[PDB]
């Protein structure tokens, strides 16, 4: 079975940087499947953020493009979410998720525990 473990969330002041990592175990991200980050403001809905596919193809949400970066490490079988210029709206719980494929469109079948990022005042 595939497993996903987030880490790296915590208390960070605005306009700073913070790097989140999603350690995959049970499957290799180079033979994937898409690999995503999905966040959720406290008490509000879900928002898709970024995705790396198995060959390295990245996709981003316009609402975060520019100041947020996804990347991977085949040698560690981990993929990361680089967060630069932390804004207030970035206070959320960040889940990483494996997307299964269906005729050009993807659904998020396997999720992680999530990690909490808090943007100071």
């Amino acid at each position: 079975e595939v497993q996903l473990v987030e880490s790296g969330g915590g208390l960070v002041q605005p306009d700073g940087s913070l790097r989140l990592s999603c350690a995959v175990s049970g499957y290799s991200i180079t033979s994937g499947y898409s690999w995503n980050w999905i966040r959720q403001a406290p008490g509000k809905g879900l928002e898709w953020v970024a995705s790396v596919t198995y060959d390295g193809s990245t996709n981003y949400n316009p609402s975060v493009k520019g100041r947020i970066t996804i990347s991977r490490d085949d040698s560690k079988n981990t993929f990361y979410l680089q967060m630069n210029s932390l804004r207030a709206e970035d206070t959320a719980v960040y889940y990483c998720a494996r997307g299964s494929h269906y005729f050009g469109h993807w659904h998020f079948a396997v999720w992680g525990q999530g990690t909490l990022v808090t943007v100071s005042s």
Binding site: Y33, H101, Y102
Partner: peptide, 9 residues
């Protein structure tokens, strides 16, 4: 009649 794979390959 078309085909697809879960992994996206």
């Amino acid at each position: 009649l078309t085909w697809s794979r879960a992994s996206g390959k």
